[PDB]
Amino acid sequence: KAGNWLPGSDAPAWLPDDLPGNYGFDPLSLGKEPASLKRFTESEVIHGRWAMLGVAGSLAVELLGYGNWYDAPLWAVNGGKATWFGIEVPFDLNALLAFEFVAMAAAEGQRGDAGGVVYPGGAFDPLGFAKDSSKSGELKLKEIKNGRLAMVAFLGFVAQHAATGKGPIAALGEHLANPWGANFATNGISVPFF
Amino acid sequence: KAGNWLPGSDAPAWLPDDLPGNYGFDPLSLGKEPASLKRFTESEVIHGRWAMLGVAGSLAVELLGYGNWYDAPLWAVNGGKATWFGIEVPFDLNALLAFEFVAMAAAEGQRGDAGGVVYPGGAFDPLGFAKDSSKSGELKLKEIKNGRLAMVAFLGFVAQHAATGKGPIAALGEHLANPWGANFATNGISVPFF
Amino acid sequence: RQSWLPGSQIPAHLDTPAAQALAGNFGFDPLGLGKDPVALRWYQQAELIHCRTAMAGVAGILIPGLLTKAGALNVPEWYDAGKVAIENSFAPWGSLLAVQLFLCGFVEAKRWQDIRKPGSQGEPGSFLGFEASLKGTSELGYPGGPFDPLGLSKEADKWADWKLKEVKNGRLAMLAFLGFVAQKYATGAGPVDNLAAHLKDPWHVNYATNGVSLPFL
Amino acid sequence: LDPQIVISGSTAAFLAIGRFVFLGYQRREANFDSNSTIFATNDPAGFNIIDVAGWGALGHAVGFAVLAINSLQG
Amino acid sequence: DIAGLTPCSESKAYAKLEKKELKTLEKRLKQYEADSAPAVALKATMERTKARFANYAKAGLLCGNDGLPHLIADPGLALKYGHAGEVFIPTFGFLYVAGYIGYVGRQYLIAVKGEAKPTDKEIIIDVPLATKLAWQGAGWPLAAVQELQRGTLLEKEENITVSPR
Amino acid sequence: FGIGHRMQAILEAHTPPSGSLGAGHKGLFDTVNNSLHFQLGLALASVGTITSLVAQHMYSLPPYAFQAIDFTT
Amino acid sequence: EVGPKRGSLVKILRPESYWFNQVGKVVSVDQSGVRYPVVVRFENQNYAGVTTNNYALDEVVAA
Numbered sequence: 001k002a003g004n005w006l007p008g009s010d011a012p013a014w015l016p017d018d019l020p021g022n023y024g025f026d027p028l029s030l031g032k033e034p035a036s037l038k039r040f041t042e043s044e045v046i047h048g049r050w051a052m053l054g055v056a057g058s059l060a061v062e063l064l065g066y067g068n069w070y071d072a073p074l075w076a077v078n079g080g081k082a083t084w085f086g087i088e089v090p091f092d093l094n095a096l097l098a099f100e101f102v103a104m105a106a107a108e109g110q111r112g113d114a115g116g117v118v119y120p121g122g123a124f125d126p127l128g129f130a131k132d133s134s135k136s137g138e139l140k141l142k143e144i145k146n147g148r149l150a151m152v153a154f155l156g157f158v159a160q161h162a163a164t165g166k167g168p169i170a171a172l173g174e175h176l177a178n179p180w181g182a183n184f185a186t187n188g189i190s191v192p193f194f
Numbered sequence: 195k196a197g198n199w200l201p202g203s204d205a206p207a208w209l210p211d212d213l214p215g216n217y218g219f220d221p222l223s224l225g226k227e228p229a230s231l232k233r234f235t236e237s238e239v240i241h242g243r244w245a246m247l248g249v250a251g252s253l254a255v256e257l258l259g260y261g262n263w264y265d266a267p268l269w270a271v272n273g274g275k276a277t278w279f280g281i282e283v284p285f286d287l288n289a290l291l292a293f294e295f296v297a298m299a300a301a302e303g304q305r306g307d308a309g310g311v312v313y314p315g316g317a318f319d320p321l322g323f324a325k326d327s328s329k330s331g332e333l334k335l336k337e338i339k340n341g342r343l344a345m346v347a348f349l350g351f352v353a354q355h356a357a358t359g360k361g362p363i364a365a366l367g368e369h370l371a372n373p374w375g376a377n378f379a380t381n382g383i384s385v386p387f388f
Numbered sequence: 389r390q391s392w393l394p395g396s397q398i399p400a401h402l403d404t405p406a407a408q409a410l411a412g413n414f415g416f417d418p419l420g421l422g423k424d425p426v427a428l429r430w431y432q433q434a435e436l437i438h439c440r441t442a443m444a445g446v447a448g449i450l451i452p453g454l455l456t457k458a459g460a461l462n463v464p465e466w467y468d469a470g471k472v473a474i475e476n477s478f479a480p481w482g483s484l485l486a487v488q489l490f491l492c493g494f495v496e497a498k499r500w501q502d503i504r505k506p507g508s509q510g511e512p513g514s515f516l517g518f519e520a521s522l523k524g525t526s527e528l529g530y531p532g533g534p535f536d537p538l539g540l541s542k543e544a545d546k547w548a549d550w551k552l553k554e555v556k557n558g559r560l561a562m563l564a565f566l567g568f569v570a571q572k573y574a575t576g577a578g579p580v581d582n583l584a585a586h587l588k589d590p591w592h593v594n595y596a597t598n599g600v601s602l603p604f605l
Numbered sequence: 606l607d608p609q610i611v612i613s614g615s616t617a618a619f620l621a622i623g624r625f626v627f628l629g630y631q632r633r634e635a636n637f638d639s640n641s642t643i644f645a646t647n648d649p650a651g652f653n654i655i656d657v658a659g660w661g662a663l664g665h666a667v668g669f670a671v672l673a674i675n676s677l678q679g
Numbered sequence: 680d681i682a683g684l685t686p687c688s689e690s691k692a693y694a695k696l697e698k699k700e701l702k703t704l705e706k707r708l709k710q711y712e713a714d715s716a717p718a719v720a721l722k723a724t725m726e727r728t729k730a731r732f733a734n735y736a737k738a739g740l741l742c743g744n745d746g747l748p749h750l751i752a753d754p755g756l757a758l759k760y761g762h763a764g765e766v767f768i769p770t771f772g773f774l775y776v777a778g779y780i781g782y783v784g785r786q787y788l789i790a791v792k793g794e795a796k797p798t799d800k801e802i803i804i805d806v807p808l809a810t811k812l813a814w815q816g817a818g819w820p821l822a823a824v825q826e827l828q829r830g831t832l833l834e835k836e837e838n839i840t841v842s843p844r
Numbered sequence: 845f846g847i848g849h850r851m852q853a854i855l856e857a858h859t860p861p862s863g864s865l866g867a868g869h870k871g872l873f874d875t876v877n878n879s880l881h882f883q884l885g886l887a888l889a890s891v892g893t894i895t896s897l898v899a900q901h902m903y904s905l906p907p908y909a910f911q912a913i914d915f916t917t
Numbered sequence: 918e919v920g921p922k923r924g925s926l927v928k929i930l931r932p933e934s935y936w937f938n939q940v941g942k943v944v945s946v947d948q949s950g951v952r953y954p955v956v957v958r959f960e961n962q963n964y965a966g967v968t969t970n971n972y973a974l975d976e977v978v979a980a
């Protein structure tokens with residue numbers, strides 16, 4: 001196992017030991033059924049990968065200086081043009097929905113028709129970092145841990161924005177300037193009685 | 195054993211006799227288990243080396259007339275440029291954190307991947323001062339003792355600074371000028387009633 | 389067999405050898421809340437935590453208050469020290485309470501898991517090698533390792549006496565804090581002020597003359 | 606906005622995703638769904654006239670919704 | 680404040696209603712003597728009315744357009760604007776007394792169910808046992824939580840009779 | 845025409861995995877299609893709720909001209 | 918010797934019985950091939966005021 005989410009508590013019997021990122025965390029027993037646990041595994045891996053890409057993009061835009069993740073689609077609501085890396089994109093919102101819908105429909109349709117494949121390999125791994133399944137167990141643990149961390153980070157991005165109105169980098173700088181005076185307990189939104 | 199921390203007391207049975215700096219000091223029984231003793235031993239040696247470097251750096255920077263250890267990072271709080279030995283450095287705080295993080299992460303990862311090695315040797319000992327294992331035990335005792343003294347000295351540096359405000363060299367001169375009038379009992383915070 | 393009421397029938401659940409091993413057993417349980425052994429064990433842990441917390445709080449209220457009466461200190465009243473301390477502070481009360489709740493929740497959760505499973509906090513490779521010292525002794529609520537640095541619990545001859553001095557004192561402290569609240573709602577002054585006012589004239593300055601504790605008189 | 610271009614593109618896109626993407630999933634779901642007329646076609650993938658009508662209907666609805674939203678000027 | 684209401688200490692209809700009640704009481708008092716029983720009783724009623732109005736205004740109650748106090752049942756609004764004494768504290772008070780009664784009755788039934796004739800104890804109340812259980816019922820929430828956690832609060836499905844469906 | 849759904853398949857494929865609802869809706873297609881009282885009860889329940897909805901929406905949002913002034917109506 | 922012991926407590930398994938899933942005392946068990954040889958007496962009377970009934974061997978379980 002990867003560890004213990006509750007030091008001293010017995011791990012659930014429905015969680016296999018060879019499962020990556022198995023910390024024995026299942027208080028609600030959601031993955032008790034073997035069929036549900038199989039779907040939950042690929043769902044968590046897909047969510048982790050999407051959240052990793054999303055958090056990386058949200059941090060990259062603010063670090064480079066093109067606004068935050070929330071202000072990015074503000075060009076399509078009131079007379080604006082999309083700018084990727086400071087370069088004007090010649091596509092309107094109507095063309096973006098068609099391209100994205102068709103592309104995502106085709107990709108996700110092939111993925112769904114595959115039959116719940118979590119680790120495809122081959123064309124998706126040109127460098128061959130997981131050619132042998134012996135060392136792939138340790139690399140999968142890093143992927144699931146980074147995915148869970150990125151999921152928590154994206155949830156934190158959404159919550160901190162909905163509570164203050166600033167981007168993740170701006171909130172980090174404000175917290176660094178005043179840690180005790182600028183946190184979730186001082187925004188007047190999270191805890192109403194503070 | 196190196197000695198007895200408490201004269202008349204019996205040394206603990208969980209502390210090996212060949213361990214460097216073994217004075218039998220373990221009243222809390224923290225290193226009772228063998229797995230914890232190994233990690234704590236490596237941690238103590240690493241702490242001693244880092245403390246020796248820190249105390250030597252603080253003493254040298256205050257003795258050479260380049261400020262104390264507390265005012266060293268003050269240039270990045272009000273706007274300024276760091277200076278090493280009177281020579282200006284064009285690296286800002288943002289570029290310093292990234293380079294230090296990458297270098298320290300790589301070095302510490304390489305050190306930890308060896309399985310907790312305390313005395314690597316080879317490339318780290320080009321002069322061969324510990325080529326023979328007979329004299330290795332004596333020098334290890336000197337290293338752990340100097341490291342413990344440096345750790346105590348750094349704790350004293352931080353405590354005396356937070357109690358008075360001056361640096362270690364300035365505090366030593368003040369105590370040498372007025373020993374009875376300047377000590378920990380006259381700072382106003384160590385002894386509350388007096 | 390010491391009893392809280394000479395002649396009263398001691399409950400059967402407080403006369404068992406397991407219940408008699410608890411410190412300060414005086415057969416006091418009129419409501420019968422400790423009939424269940426599991427409930428009795430849980431309440432024993434709660435009483436120990438209450439005793440230690442009340443002793444620390446009552447000490448922090450009485451000693452600085454007694455020193456303030458003299459010229460040793462100038463600590464304000466316990467019911468007003470929070471505002472005075474938060475005025476010239478580096479953080480608001482909300483942020484401080486949040487940090488406190490996180491730090492207290494971690495150790496309280498570890499203590500809770502140890503209550504549910506004794507010695508379970510000694511799981512290897514889980515607390516950076518410090519898990520070996522996180523295993524309590526054979527008695528619940530009395531851990532060693534980092535706690536008890538002087539090692540005064542290793543001597544069994546005084547052990548049974550030591551526990552008797554911890555619960556009893558704690559119980560007294562638990563009542564002291566309660567009085568500190570009631571007096572605050574009946575006189576409007578601090579505990580040392582009430583003690584001095586009563587010592588000046590006990591036959592006329594007491595709870596029978598405050599006009600609150602006896603509304604029918 | 607050209608209505609012909611939008612309608613033609615939406616219909617062609619839905620027909621393409623219905624013939625090359627969701628055809629296998631639909632066939633697997635239709636067979637597992639358990640008088641009739643067999644609408645046999647020469648299409649190598651079995652894409653018959655009924656599937657053409659269904660996917661064309663979805664494409665037309667999407668195209669007209671897009672045209673309507675763009676006509677609202679918002 | 681809450682729901683567009685105004686505090687009773689500032690409502691004009693509240694003071695008007697107080698004046699109306701005192702006016703009808705004074706009008707009834709005008710027909711009697713000054714040192715008789717009806718005069719003293721009417722004066723006592725007037726003082727009680729004045730004290731009641733002052734106490735309701737001092738409590739911070741909210742009055743509507745009719746000048747009558749309005750209660751706040753939402754825990755958030757009650758705890759945020761100082762109205763917990765209307766519906767929150769009395770809620771927990773009733774819960775404590777109701778659970779007290781229910782727990783004492785359940786304990787009495789369980790105690791007399793293991794005797795020779797439980798029905799006889801049900802019609803002829805055993806006063807010593809009932810008094811002991813009534814005094815011991817002060818810790819009903821703790822005892823109830825302990826019974827629920829041990830699994831002894833409920834009865835198994837196989838031991839309860841049901842219809843043939 | 846091959847496309848579409850079969851209500852029996854949707855009912856049979858709607859059982860929770862943990863078994864909270866037991867067999868789920870297995871056999872519910874036959875007990876509804878073969879029972880006219882079940883269909884009549886469902887129809888009357890929906891029609892009664894819709895009639896109440898009509899009453900509420902009709903007094904609150906009058907759809908006919910000069911209906912709100914006619915108090916008796 | 919067939920059937921439950923006399924004086925023992927059994928649980929009624931008859932669904933249409935008033936004492937279904939209830940405990941009753943065994944009075945006597947018939948040794949012939951009758952359909953319901955077990956005689957069970959109950960502390961609580963039914964709607965008809967009866968406190969005893971006859972049950973088969975498989976309709977009663979030792980509980």
Ligand code: CLA
Nearest residue numbers: 152153155156159160163164171172175182183184187190
């Ligand atoms: C990747 C985890 C992560 C990190 C590094 C941060 C970091 C930060 N958050 Mg944030 N947050 C997170 C998750 C995270 N958050 C989640 C999941 C939520 C939804 C509940 C929020 C909701 C949130 C709000 C509403 C606000 C912040 C704010 C902030 C900033 C000030 C600190 C604070 O008050 O936050 C408090 C965060 C929490 C109380 C929940 C943290 C979740 C866990 C504990 C952290 C993840 C694990 C962590 C890496 C290791 C934990 C071990 C430790 C407990 C021993 C700060 C830079 C504030 C801000 O904008 O700055 C002024 C602010 O108002 N966060």
Ligand code: CLA
Nearest residue numbers: 209215216217218219220224225234235237238241342345
């Ligand atoms: C964090 C640094 C550190 C660490 C990891 C160790 C680790 C160890 N020491 Mg060592 N020691 C240290 C610092 C440290 N020491 C210092 C600074 C001194 C000089 C005072 C000594 C002097 C000393 C002696 C004389 C001996 C040891 C011995 C040992 C070994 C015995 C096992 C044990 O006792 O439990 C492990 C210890 C720890 C896990 C450290 C726990 C850290 C606690 C929490 C520190 C509490 C101090 C407190 C926070 C101070 C700050 C004040 C606060 C208000 C900020 C062990 C491997 C014995 C030995 O056999 O040598 C090999 C022995 O003879 N030590």
Ligand code: CLA
Nearest residue numbers: 188189190191192193681752753754755756757758759760
């Ligand atoms: C019995 C059903 C019931 C109903 C119908 C309501 C209804 C309401 N509650 Mg509520 N509440 C209930 C039970 C109920 N409560 C119980 C049992 C508790 C004890 C746990 C609470 C404790 C509670 C609090 C602490 C608060 C409310 C609040 C509210 C009001 C708005 C929030 C909301 O709708 O989300 C449902 C309510 C909750 C999920 C409880 C949490 C509060 C949520 C997170 C909203 C708080 C954010 C903010 C204060 C919203 C107002 C913004 C601005 C106008 C100030 C609303 C009229 C809020 C309010 O208006 O304050 C005056 C408020 O802060 N309730």
Ligand code: CLA
Nearest residue numbers: 780781782783784785786787788804805808809810812813
């Ligand atoms: C031991 C006494 C007792 C207890 C613990 C309960 C408990 C309960 N009853 Mg019940 N009930 C009782 C007596 C009791 N009842 C009596 C005497 C009657 C005849 C009037 C009823 C008639 C009754 C009905 C019709 C219903 C309940 C229902 C319920 C359940 C819902 C909560 C409720 O309060 O409903 C309301 C209960 C009442 C209004 C009657 C309470 C009567 C008093 C307050 C009880 C005092 C009994 C006794 C005199 C005190 C013990 C004396 C002893 C120490 C000597 C609950 C578990 C409901 C249900 O079916 O569950 C979902 C329901 O529909 N009860």
Ligand SMILES: CC1=C[C@H](O)CC(C)(C)[C@H]1/C=C/C(C)=C/C=C/C(C)=C/C=C/C=C(C)/C=C/C=C(C)/C=C/C1=C(C)C[C@H](O)CC1(C)C
Nearest residue numbers: 026027028029030047050051054057058069072151154155
């Ligand atoms: C396990 C368990 C079990 C037990 O039993 C119970 C419980 C406890 C319940 C549990 C838990 C759970 C949880 C925690 C969950 C969570 C999740 C998450 C958070 C997700 C996210 C997730 C998330 C995600 C995906 C995300 C993603 C993101 C993205 C894409 C983004 C994108 C973007 C960007 C780039 C930027 C721009 O400008 C915009 C946009 C476009 C927008």
Ligand SMILES: CC1=C[C@H](O)CC(C)(C)[C@H]1/C=C/C(C)=C/C=C/C(C)=C/C=C/C=C(C)/C=C/C=C(C)/C=C/C1=C(C)C[C@H](O)CC1(C)C
Nearest residue numbers: 220221222223224241244245248251252263266345348349
């Ligand atoms: C053994 C034991 C066991 C038993 O059982 C019990 C008991 C008693 C608990 C114990 C004891 C313990 C102790 C004593 C501890 C301590 C430690 C320490 C002091 C550390 C430090 C340690 C310390 C350290 C590392 C330090 C380091 C330092 C440094 C790096 C510095 C740096 C720097 C410099 C140069 C200067 C500049 O300007 C700044 C900076 C950049 C900042």
Ligand SMILES: CC1=C[C@H](O)CC(C)(C)[C@H]1/C=C/C(C)=C/C=C/C(C)=C/C=C/C=C(C)/C=C/C=C(C)/C=C/C1=C(C)C[C@H](O)CC1(C)C
Nearest residue numbers: 417418419420438441442445448449466469562563565566
């Ligand atoms: C045994 C039994 C059983 C049978 O069956 C029945 C009956 C009779 C019911 C019973 C009895 C009971 C009782 C008596 C109880 C009580 C308890 C208590 C009092 C607690 C407290 C407890 C208490 C406690 C913890 C307390 C604590 C305290 C504290 C922390 C304090 C703190 C503070 C300070 C320092 C100062 C500042 O300035 C303020 C403050 C912040 C405020």
Ligand SMILES: CC1=C(/C=C/C(C)=C/C=C/C(C)=C\C=C\C=C(C)\C=C\C=C(C)\C=C\C2=C(C)C[C@H](O)CC2(C)C)C(C)(C)CCC1
Nearest residue numbers: 752753754766767770777778779780781782783785823824
């Ligand atoms: C221990 C006890 C008895 C047992 C009682 C039992 C078994 C109770 C079981 C209850 C169960 C299974 C579920 C209860 C669910 C309760 C719910 C959903 C109620 C939630 C409360 C809500 C939504 C809000 C309430 C309110 C608050 C808190 C304050 C104000 O009231 C206003 C308002 C309505 C907003 C025995 C044995 C009869 C013996 C005797 C007392």
Ligand SMILES: CC1=C(/C=C/C(C)=C/C=C/C(C)=C/C=C/C=C(C)/C=C/C=C(C)/C=C/C2=C(C)CCCC2(C)C)C(C)(C)CCC1
Nearest residue numbers: 616617620657658659660661662663665666667668669670
């Ligand atoms: C053979 C072939 C092919 C194909 C061709 C084509 C060209 C086809 C087609 C087809 C088509 C071209 C189709 C279409 C269709 C359509 C449809 C089917 C429709 C419809 C309708 C609807 C449903 C609508 C409705 C509406 C209205 C009426 C109003 C408004 C609203 C809405 C819109 C809803 C290719 C070359 C590829 C290859 C070779 C072979």
Ligand SMILES: CCCCCCCCCCCCO[C@@H]1O[C@H](CO)[C@@H](O[C@H]2O[C@H](CO)[C@@H](O)[C@H](O)[C@H]2O)[C@H](O)[C@H]1O
Nearest residue numbers: 108109110111112113114115116626627629630633634
């Ligand atoms: C915020 C906006 C972005 C979020 C967009 C969300 C859109 C979600 C659309 C869901 C579309 C369903 O898409 C369809 O899913 C099913 C069910 O998993 C997949 O079906 C696949 O898996 C299931 C079981 O997991 C198998 O039984 C099936 O044989 C296989 O094809 C299909 O291959 C895919 O075509």
